Coordinates of N, CA and C and ligand atoms in Angstrom, one line a residue:
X1 N 15.0 -20.6 -38.2 CA 15.0 -19.8 -37.0 C 16.3 -19.2 -36.6
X2 N 16.6 -17.9 -37.0 CA 17.8 -17.3 -36.7 C 17.6 -16.0 -36.0
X3 N 18.0 -16.0 -34.7 CA 17.8 -14.8 -33.8 C 19.0 -14.7 -32.9
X4 N 19.0 -13.6 -32.1 CA 20.0 -13.4 -31.1 C 19.7 -12.2 -30.2
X5 N 18.5 -12.3 -29.6 CA 18.1 -11.2 -28.7 C 17.5 -11.8 -27.4
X6 N 17.7 -11.2 -26.3 CA 17.2 -11.6 -25.0 C 17.3 -10.5 -23.9
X7 N 16.1 -10.1 -23.4 CA 16.1 -9.1 -22.4 C 15.4 -7.8 -22.9
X8 N 15.0 -7.0 -21.9 CA 14.4 -5.7 -22.3 C 15.4 -4.6 -22.6
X9 N 15.6 -4.4 -23.9 CA 16.5 -3.4 -24.3 C 16.5 -3.2 -25.8
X10 N 17.1 -2.1 -26.3 CA 17.1 -1.9 -27.8 C 15.8 -1.4 -28.3
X11 N 15.2 -0.5 -27.6 CA 13.8 0.0 -27.9 C 13.7 0.1 -29.4
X12 N 12.7 -0.7 -29.9 CA 12.5 -0.8 -31.4 C 12.7 0.5 -32.0
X13 N 11.9 1.5 -31.6 CA 11.9 2.9 -32.1 C 13.2 3.6 -31.7
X14 N 13.2 4.9 -31.9 CA 14.4 5.7 -31.5 C 14.1 6.6 -30.3
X15 N 13.6 5.9 -29.2 CA 13.3 6.6 -28.0 C 13.0 5.6 -26.9
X16 N 12.8 6.1 -25.7 CA 12.5 5.3 -24.5 C 11.0 5.0 -24.3
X17 N 10.7 4.1 -23.5 CA 9.3 3.7 -23.2 C 9.1 3.4 -21.7
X18 N 7.9 3.7 -21.2 CA 7.6 3.5 -19.8 C 7.5 2.0 -19.5
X19 N 8.2 1.5 -18.5 CA 8.1 0.1 -18.2 C 7.0 -0.2 -17.3
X20 N 6.0 0.7 -17.2 CA 4.8 0.5 -16.4 C 3.5 0.4 -17.3
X21 N 3.3 1.5 -18.1 CA 2.2 1.6 -18.9 C 2.6 1.2 -20.4
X22 N 3.9 1.2 -20.6 CA 4.4 0.9 -22.0 C 4.0 2.0 -23.0
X23 N 4.3 3.2 -22.6 CA 4.0 4.4 -23.4 C 5.3 5.2 -23.7
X24 N 5.3 5.9 -24.8 CA 6.5 6.7 -25.1 C 6.7 7.8 -24.1
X25 N 7.8 7.6 -23.3 CA 8.2 8.6 -22.3 C 8.9 9.8 -22.9
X26 N 8.3 10.9 -22.6 CA 8.9 12.2 -23.2 C 10.1 12.7 -22.3
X27 N 10.9 13.6 -22.8 CA 12.0 14.1 -22.1 C 11.6 15.1 -20.9
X28 N 10.3 15.2 -20.8 CA 9.7 16.0 -19.7 C 9.2 15.2 -18.5
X29 N 8.8 14.0 -18.8 CA 8.3 13.1 -17.8 C 9.2 11.8 -17.7
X30 N 10.4 12.0 -18.1 CA 11.3 10.8 -18.0 C 12.0 10.8 -16.7
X31 N 11.6 9.8 -15.9 CA 12.1 9.6 -14.5 C 12.9 8.3 -14.4
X32 N 14.2 8.4 -14.3 CA 15.1 7.3 -14.2 C 14.9 6.6 -12.9
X33 N 14.7 5.3 -12.9 CA 14.5 4.5 -11.7 C 15.0 3.1 -11.8
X34 N 16.0 2.7 -11.1 CA 16.6 1.4 -11.2 C 17.1 1.1 -12.6
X35 N 17.7 2.1 -13.2 CA 18.3 1.9 -14.6 C 17.1 1.7 -15.6
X36 N 16.0 2.2 -15.4 CA 14.8 2.1 -16.2 C 14.0 3.3 -16.3
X37 N 13.4 3.6 -17.5 CA 12.6 4.8 -17.6 C 11.2 4.6 -17.0
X38 N 10.9 5.5 -16.1 CA 9.6 5.5 -15.4 C 8.9 6.8 -15.4
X39 N 7.6 6.8 -15.4 CA 6.7 8.0 -15.4 C 6.6 8.6 -14.0
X40 N 7.0 9.8 -13.9 CA 6.9 10.5 -12.6 C 5.6 10.2 -11.9
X41 N 4.6 9.8 -12.7 CA 3.3 9.4 -12.1 C 3.2 7.9 -11.9
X42 N 3.5 7.1 -12.9 CA 3.4 5.7 -12.8 C 4.2 5.2 -11.6
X43 N 5.4 5.8 -11.4 CA 6.3 5.4 -10.3 C 5.5 5.2 -9.0
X44 N 5.1 4.0 -8.8 CA 4.3 3.7 -7.6 C 4.6 2.3 -7.1
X45 N 4.0 1.9 -6.0 CA 4.3 0.5 -5.4 C 3.4 -0.5 -6.0
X46 N 3.9 -1.7 -6.4 CA 3.2 -2.7 -7.0 C 2.4 -3.5 -5.9
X47 N 2.2 -2.9 -4.8 CA 1.4 -3.5 -3.7 C 0.2 -2.7 -3.3
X48 N 0.5 -1.4 -3.0 CA -0.5 -0.5 -2.6 C -0.9 0.5 -3.8
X49 N 0.1 0.7 -4.7 CA -0.1 1.6 -5.8 C -0.2 3.0 -5.4
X50 N 0.8 3.5 -4.6 CA 0.9 4.8 -4.2 C 2.1 5.6 -4.8
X51 N 1.9 6.9 -4.9 CA 2.9 7.7 -5.5 C 4.2 7.7 -4.7
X52 N 5.3 7.5 -5.4 CA 6.6 7.5 -4.7 C 7.6 8.4 -5.4
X53 N 8.8 8.6 -4.8 CA 9.9 9.4 -5.4 C 11.2 8.7 -5.5
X54 N 12.2 9.4 -5.9 CA 13.6 8.8 -6.0 C 14.2 8.7 -4.7
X55 N 13.5 8.2 -3.7 CA 14.0 8.1 -2.3 C 13.2 7.2 -1.5
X56 N 11.9 7.2 -1.7 CA 11.0 6.4 -0.9 C 10.7 5.1 -1.6
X57 N 11.0 5.0 -2.9 CA 10.8 3.8 -3.7 C 11.8 2.7 -3.3
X58 N 11.6 1.5 -3.9 CA 12.5 0.4 -3.7 C 12.3 -0.7 -4.6
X59 N 13.2 -0.9 -5.6 CA 13.0 -2.0 -6.6 C 13.9 -3.2 -6.2
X60 N 13.4 -4.4 -6.5 CA 14.2 -5.6 -6.2 C 14.5 -6.4 -7.5
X61 N 13.4 -7.0 -8.0 CA 13.6 -7.8 -9.3 C 12.9 -7.1 -10.4
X62 N 12.9 -5.8 -10.4 CA 12.3 -5.0 -11.5 C 11.0 -4.3 -11.0
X63 N 10.3 -4.9 -10.1 CA 9.1 -4.4 -9.5 C 9.4 -3.3 -8.4
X64 N 8.6 -2.3 -8.4 CA 8.7 -1.2 -7.4 C 8.0 -1.5 -6.1
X65 N 8.4 -1.0 -5.0 CA 7.8 -1.2 -3.7 C 8.1 0.0 -2.8
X66 N 7.1 0.2 -1.9 CA 7.3 1.3 -0.9 C 8.0 0.8 0.3
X67 N 8.9 1.6 0.8 CA 9.7 1.3 2.0 C 9.0 0.3 2.9
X68 N 7.8 0.7 3.3 CA 6.9 -0.1 4.2 C 6.8 -1.5 3.7
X69 N 6.2 -1.7 2.6 CA 6.0 -3.0 2.0 C 7.3 -3.7 1.7
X70 N 8.2 -2.9 1.0 CA 9.5 -3.4 0.7 C 10.2 -4.1 1.9
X71 N 10.2 -3.4 3.0 CA 10.8 -3.9 4.2 C 9.9 -5.0 4.9
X72 N 8.6 -4.7 4.8 CA 7.6 -5.6 5.4 C 7.7 -7.0 4.8
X73 N 8.2 -7.0 3.6 CA 8.4 -8.3 2.9 C 9.8 -8.7 2.8
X74 N 10.7 -7.8 2.3 CA 12.1 -8.1 2.2 C 12.7 -8.4 3.6
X75 N 12.9 -7.4 4.4 CA 13.5 -7.5 5.7 C 13.0 -8.8 6.4
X76 N 13.7 -9.3 7.3 CA 13.3 -10.5 8.0 C 14.3 -10.9 9.1
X77 N 14.1 -12.0 9.8 CA 15.0 -12.5 10.8 C 15.1 -14.0 10.7
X78 N 15.9 -14.6 11.7 CA 16.1 -16.0 11.7 C 14.8 -16.8 11.4
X79 N 14.9 -17.5 10.3 CA 13.7 -18.3 9.8 C 14.1 -19.1 8.6
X80 N 14.2 -20.4 8.7 CA 14.5 -21.3 7.6 C 13.9 -22.7 7.9
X81 N 13.7 -23.5 6.8 CA 13.2 -24.8 6.9 C 14.3 -25.8 6.5
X82 N 13.9 -27.1 6.7 CA 14.9 -28.2 6.4 C 14.6 -28.8 5.0
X83 N 14.4 -27.9 4.1 CA 14.1 -28.3 2.7 C 15.4 -28.5 1.9
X84 N 16.1 -27.4 1.7 CA 17.4 -27.4 1.0 C 18.1 -28.7 1.3
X85 N 18.9 -29.2 0.3 CA 19.7 -30.4 0.5 C 20.3 -30.9 -0.8
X86 N 21.4 -31.5 -0.7 CA 22.1 -32.1 -1.8 C 22.7 -33.5 -1.6
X87 N 22.8 -34.3 -2.6 CA 23.3 -35.6 -2.5 C 24.0 -36.2 -3.7
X88 N 24.9 -37.1 -3.6 CA 25.6 -37.7 -4.7 C 24.8 -38.6 -5.5
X89 N 25.2 -39.0 -6.7 CA 24.5 -39.8 -7.6 C 25.4 -40.4 -8.7
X90 N 25.3 -41.7 -8.9 CA 26.1 -42.4 -9.9 C 25.9 -41.7 -11.3
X91 N 27.1 -41.5 -11.9 CA 27.0 -40.8 -13.2 C 27.8 -41.6 -14.3
Ligands
LIG1 ZN1 3.9 5.3 -17.6
LIG2 ZN1 3.3 -0.5 -0.9

């Protein structure tokens, strides 16, 4: 077992591909979004699945989202639990 690759890059072929439908994106429908090739059509919210543009969209961990949902989920206020915690241990 001898390899050395990790991550989405180095398109096998000699072109780009849609990170939504996984299809060969042409130079006519190539829409750059979050440093990734997206289809002017595919470009939608992974929550409601609505058409978006290079201004109303919002990506976080690779997935797209509409301002509404993006903020409705992302944005927030004072709210935390007493879960987190650390402690020493003999080593
Ligand atoms: Zn597509
Ligand atoms: Zn949405």
